[PDB]
Paper text:
EV71 is a picornavirus and its capsid contains 60 copies of each of four proteins VP1–VP4, arranged with pseudo T = 3 symmetry. In contrast to the canyon and fivefold vertex epitopes, the margin of the pentamer is not within or adjacent to known receptor binding sites, but we have shown that natural infection can induce neutralizing antibody responses to this part of the viral capsid (notably the so-called the plateau epitope, located close to the icosahedral threefold axes). The cryo-electron microscopy (cryo-EM) structures of the EV71 virion in complex with two representative plateau-binding neutralizing antibodies reveal that their binding footprints are conserved in the great majority of circulating EV71 strains and these antibodies are therapeutic for lethal challenge in a murine infection. In summary we have shown that humans naturally infected with EV71 make an antibody response that includes rare neutralizing and highly protective antibodies that bind close to the threefold axes of the virus capsid, and larger numbers of non-neutralizing antibodies, many of which do not bind the viral capsid.
The nine copies in the asymmetric unit were essentially identical (rmsd 0.7 Å). We analyzed the sequences of neutralizing antibodies 38-1-10A, 38-1-2A and 38-3-11A using the IMGT tool to determine its closest Vh and Vl germline genes. The antibody Vl genes were also identical to germlines (IGKV1-6*01 for 38-1-10A and 38-1-2A; IGKV1-39*01 for 38-3-11A).
Author numbering:
A (entry chain L): 1 to 213
B (entry chain H): 1 to 135, 141 to 221
């Protein structure tokens, strides 16, 4: 089958820059090429069809070029809402193949996270487990460290983290860390602390609570 | 304005048959200018075309799945459907329907996509716990714990509250069950007057829960 080699796999560009994504066909496909944009949790959206024809409603800063084996999607002036994964599609000889995709990340200024800590709810303590949640809100870049302290004792293996994708408006990230304990062990201790280190903070920020109060 | 609504179960047992239907509104599926296709996307992976169908019934299939795929069209009911036989865990993916124009690589519009999990495991509904705000702006949220399979949908105030909302990707736990949290930042002055309700929907178990979040 005809193979579409899409490149690069991922790129990082600032707002206003020119993004260039290339897609190479293993053999000639004339102009039977389409370019698609996929934002998180949404279906792919058509940007360009027939290699260089702009779809109605698509902003003019998107443009495609090429014929034969070499095709190019260009975003002339990158915008925050353009964070997405982009895909080429060929349908030559009525056998369709997609490229591997290009994840386009937005490069912006450092933003320090806002940190919140949530105690376990009362109705969950009735089930026998306790979940402490730590929220890191609207930060950039993505690298961040979270440490849990139970009576100022470090925890490991009892927490999981989740990170949102880059926000389409401010280009920041958010992270949530969930520390899960048994009810029996949640009641043995008083101090529950969440400690975050990030590039945008002059020194680690700690949010904490005491069981009760 | 053409709209595609797809339907079908999101959980299929191994070796059984995946079945999905796409219903076309705002236009006729009996158009000589369009084909009607299925595309799938495994979690974290790329896009794969499954096949397309013309309103007369002629089909074009992805040859790597042709032995296992059937695509039919029902012009009287303005639908087209997909059947995938002997599914395995490798068939877990989000399945999309789309309207196609041949040769120019045109897929527009698309369905919202249905995630289908191939697993023999049983369906489990989630428990929802409040992330109570404790403190200019305050953060509050919901903990959606212990469900199977994916996905759950979370909105706030039945969709009326969207700004500042962050629903985090689901997290797989050691038991094999999923868990996520959804949070929103609001002005602290609205806590005792404005109501903040998270609406959790888990279609595999047909469970819809509304948890009102109050300061503890």
């Amino acid at each position: 089958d005809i193979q579409m080699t899409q490149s690069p796999s991922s790129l990082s560009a600032s707002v206003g820059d020119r993004v260039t994504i290339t897609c190479r066909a293993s053999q000639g496909i004339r102009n039977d090429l389409g370019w698609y944009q996929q934002k998180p949790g949404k279906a792919p959206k058509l940007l360009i069809y027939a290699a260089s024809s702009l779809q109605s409603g698509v902003p003019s800063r998107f443009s495609g070029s090429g014929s034969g084996t070499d095709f190019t999607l260009t975003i002339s002036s990158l915008q925050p809402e353009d964070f997405a994964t982009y895909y080429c599609l060929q349908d030559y000889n009525y056998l369709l193949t997609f490229g591997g995709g290009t994840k386009v990340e937005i490069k912006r200024t450092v933003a320090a996270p806002s940190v919140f800590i949530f105690p376990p709810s009362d109705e969950q303590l009735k089930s026998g487990t306790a979940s402490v949640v730590c929220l890191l809100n609207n930060f950039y870049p993505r690298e961040a460290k979270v440490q849990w302290k139970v009576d100022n004792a470090l925890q490991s293996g009892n927490s999981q983290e989740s990170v949102t994708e880059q926000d389409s408006k401010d280009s920041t990230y958010s992270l949530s860390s969930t520390l899960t304990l048994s009810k029996a062990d949640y009641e043995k201790h008083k101090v529950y602390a969440c400690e975050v280190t990030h590039q945008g903070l002059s020194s680690p920020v700690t949010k904490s609570f005491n069981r009760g109060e | 304005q053409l709209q595609l609504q797809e339907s079908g179960p999101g959980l299929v047992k191994p070796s059984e048959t995946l079945s999905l239907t796409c219903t076309v509104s705002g236009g006729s599926i009996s158009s000589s200018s369009y084909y009607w296709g299925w595309i799938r996307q495994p979690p974290g992976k790329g896009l794969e075309w499954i096949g397309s169908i013309y309103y007369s019934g002629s089909t074009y299939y992805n040859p790597s799945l042709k032995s296992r795929v059937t695509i039919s069209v029902d012009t009287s009911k303005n639908q087209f459907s997909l059947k995938l036989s002997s599914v395995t865990a490798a068939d877990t993916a989000v399945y999309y329907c789309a309207r196609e124009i041949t040769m120019i690589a045109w897929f527009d519009p698309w369905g919202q996509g249905t995630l289908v999990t191939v697993s023999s495991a049983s369906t489990k509904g989630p428990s929802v716990f409040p992330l109570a705000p404790s403190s200019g702006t305050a953060a509050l949220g919901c903990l959606v714990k212990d469900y199977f399979p994916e996905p759950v949908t979370v909105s706030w105030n039945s969709g009326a509250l969207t700004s500042g909302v962050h629903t985090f990707p689901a997290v797989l736990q050691s038991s094999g069950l999923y868990s996520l949290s959804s949070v929103v930042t609001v002005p602290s002055s609205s806590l005792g007057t404005q109501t903040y309700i998270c609406n959790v929907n888990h279609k595999p178990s047909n469970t819809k829960v509304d948890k009102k979040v109050e300061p503890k």
